[PDB]
């Protein structure tokens, strides 16, 4: 609760209006895997569709709370149709982006003053506090479709490079094949699944997105940004791994590696490597520069 | 093999379209539930005005014989 | 060992390919649209009934002042 008056004496005198929102830990279970760390650095930003695009980045400190007299609210405290996003980190390796929406808030702000609301993006119940001082369908979809268009172009670019090389293969990474099977040259089974998952994988924190955003010329030219999502959907996919290889050695890994210059590499089990090319218009650079940086 | 590429795109198009069908129906269901709650509160919120003004009519009509 | 790697991939292909089917139907939206019009007709019916009673009560108020 102290965070509200802290903002109103320091940031509320820099930003006009504020809506004070409390998030249960069950809603936190969406973003963070297997961790309950305190949410100080959490950055809330706004993002509004179909007119113009802008974000304003601010920390509201979160602490776990016993202060509701109602038992049910035991937990953490921190043009309608648009988005807010909370970017959550700690000292360790954990980054999450949560999306709060409107028309849960303007209806929710209706009278411990508290009311329950629903999430649209990641459906759970949240609770809104009101302090005594106080075109639908295209709007969420864009961050999906934009990124998925990139995937299609990247996938098509792979095909063009295979069209360069008489449509077979070449091995760029020294990985010994697991055995010299006779029943291995049906590896057409593998490459199809690449175009299965690469098109069905879309998230804001893809590897090539971080490859687009480069602080330096030299160190990103020397550095590789990789992600491996497993085959066929068993488990949780990892994005944004840094290489300051073993991925080709172990199975269940369609490795994908992007340089900062937009050059991509699809690596199959067995060390087969296909180079891919990226195409980004300055609109796309403007969008990724806006959100990511 | 170049022929299997198309097959990979066809299955991927099917899955990507099904994701939107499922997401769109779920969000329509949840938001329509929210607006049924909203119209419930709306009709109650002016039924309050109705009953406040009815009580105003009776409370001032009790003062009619004190205003004649 | 490549044998167990292949067996895990094969059983994985079975269940992971099985996870693909999804279903959707259109008629639910049209029935949902029909119910709103029905409820609107019903609310208009009760509204006009209570309007006729409200118009009648003023007439009774003018009529029974004669008895005094």
Using DSSP bridges, classify how beta strands A224-229 and A254-258 pair: parallel, antiparallel or unpaired: antiparallel
Find, in chain A, the residue whose alpha carbon is nearest to that of B20.
A141
Burial class (CB in 10 A: 0-12, 13-18, 19+), A214: middle
User: Of the candidates C5, C16, C17, which has its C-beta nearest A251's C-beta?
Assistant: C5
Strand runs labelled E in C1-68 = none
The neighbouring-strand residues paired with A65 are A75
Torsion of CA A130, A136, A138, A139, to 10 degrees: -10
Distance CA C26, CA A161 (A): 43
Distance CA A132, CA A9 (A): 16
Residues of chain A with C-beta less than 8 angstroms from the C-beta of B16: 148, 199-200
Residues of chain C with C-beta less than 8 angstroms from the C-beta of B15: 20
Whether residue A207 contacts residue A214, with contact meaning beta carbons closer than 8 Å, is answered with no
Whether residue A243 contacts residue A252, with contact meaning beta carbons closer than 8 Å, is answered with no
Whether residue A227 contacts residue A237, with contact meaning beta carbons closer than 8 Å, is answered with yes
Q: How many CB atoms lie within 10 A of CB A107?
A: 17
Q: Which of B24, B26, B31 to mutate to test the interface with A (most CBs of A within 10 A)?
A: B31
Instruction: Give the DSSP letter of residue A230.
Output: P
Q: Is A264 helix (H, G, I), strand (E, B) or coil?
A: strand
Element (H, E) at A228: strand A224-229
Per-residue CA distances from A172 to A265, A275, C20 (Å): 10, 10, 34
Torsion of CA A184, A198, B17, A124, to 10 degrees: 120
C12:A251 CB<8 A: no
Distance CA B18, CA A200 (A): 11
Torsion of CA A264, A267, A273, A274, to 10 degrees: -50
Q: Between helices A188-200 and B3-61, what is the axis angle to 10°?
A: 20
Distance CA A232, CA A235 (A): 9
> Residue A77 phi/psi, 5° resolution?
-125, 125
Residues of chain A with C-beta less than 8 angstroms from the C-beta of B34: 103-104, 107, 118
Using DSSP bridges, classify how beta strands A58-59 and A95-101 pair: parallel, antiparallel or unpaired: unpaired
Residue of A222, A142, A154 whose CA lies nearest to A194: A154
Q: How far is A145 from chain C (nearest CA, A)?
A: 21
User: Of the candidates C2, C12, C17, which has its C-beta nearest A234's C-beta?
Assistant: C12
Q: Is A280 helix (H, G, I), strand (E, B) or coil?
A: coil
Q: How many CB atoms lie within 10 A of CB A203?
A: 15
With an 8 Å Cβ cutoff, is C16 touching chain A?
A: yes
Q: How was this structure determined?
A: cryo-EM
> Residue A83 phi/psi, 5° resolution?
-115, 145
String of DSSP letters for A85-128: EEEEE-SSS-EEEEEEESSSHHHHS----EEEEE-SSS--EEEE
Resolution in A: 4.4
Length of chain A: 293
Residue of A78, A133, A82, A73 whose CA lies nearest to A105: A82
Cβ-based interface (< 8 Å): residues of C facing B: 20, 22, 24
Distance CA A109, CA A105 (A): 6
Residues of chain B with C-beta less than 8 angstroms from the C-beta of C20: 15
Q: How far is A160 from chain B (nearest CA, A)?
A: 11
Q: Is C66 helix (H, G, I), strand (E, B) or coil?
A: helix
C22:B18 CB<8 A: yes
């Amino acid at each position: 609760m102290d965070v509200h008056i802290d903002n109103q004496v320091l940031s509320g005198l820099g930003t006009p209006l504020l809506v004070h929102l409390f998030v249960p830990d069950t809603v936190m279970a969406e973003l963070c895997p297997n961790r309950v760390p305190n949410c100080e650095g959490a950055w809330c930003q706004t993002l509004f569709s179909d007119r113009t695009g802008l974000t304003r980045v601010c920390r509201v400190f979160a602490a776990r709370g016993m202060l509701p007299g109602r038992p049910s609210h035991r937990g953490t405290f921190t043009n309608p149709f648009h988005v807010a996003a909370l970017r959550f980190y700690d000292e360790g390796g954990l980054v999450g982006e949560l999306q709060i929406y409107y028309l849960s808030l303007f209806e929710g702000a209706k009278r411990a003053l508290v009311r329950g609301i629903a999430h649209i993006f990641s459906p759970h119940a949240l609770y809104v506090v009101t302090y005594p001082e106080l075109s639908i369908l295209g709007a969420p979809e864009r961050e999906f479709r934009f990124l998925i268009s990139v995937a299609l172009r990247i996938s098509a670019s792979f095909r063009e490079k295979l069209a360069m090389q008489a449509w077979t293969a070449q091995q760029e990474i020294p990985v010994v094949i697991p055995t010299s099977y006779s029943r291995i040259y049906k590896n057409s089974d593998l490459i199809r699944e690449a175009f299965f998952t690469v098109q069905t994988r879309v998230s804001w924190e893809s590897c090539w997105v971080k490859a687009t955003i480069s602080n330096a010329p030299k160190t990103p030219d020397a550095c590789l940004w990789i992600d491996s999502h497993p085959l066929y959907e068993e488990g949780a996919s990892a994005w944004g791994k840094v290489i300051d290889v073993a991925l080709g050695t172990d199975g269940h890994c369609v490795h994908l590696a992007t340089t900062s210059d937009g050059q991509a590499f699809l690596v199959l089990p067995g060390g087969f490597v296909i180079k891919g090319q990226l195409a980004l218009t300055p609109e796309e650079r403007g969008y990724i520069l806006a959100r990511h940086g | 093999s170049p022929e299997a590429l198309e097959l990979a795109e066809r299955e991927a198009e099917r899955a990507r379209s099904e994701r939107w069908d499922r997401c769109a129906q779920v969000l329509k269901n949840r938001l329509l539930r929210v607006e049924l709650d909203g119209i419930m509160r709306d009709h109650l919120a002016r039924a309050e005005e109705i009953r406040q003004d009815l009580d105003a009519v009776v409370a001032f009509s009790d003062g009619l014989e004190s205003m004649q």
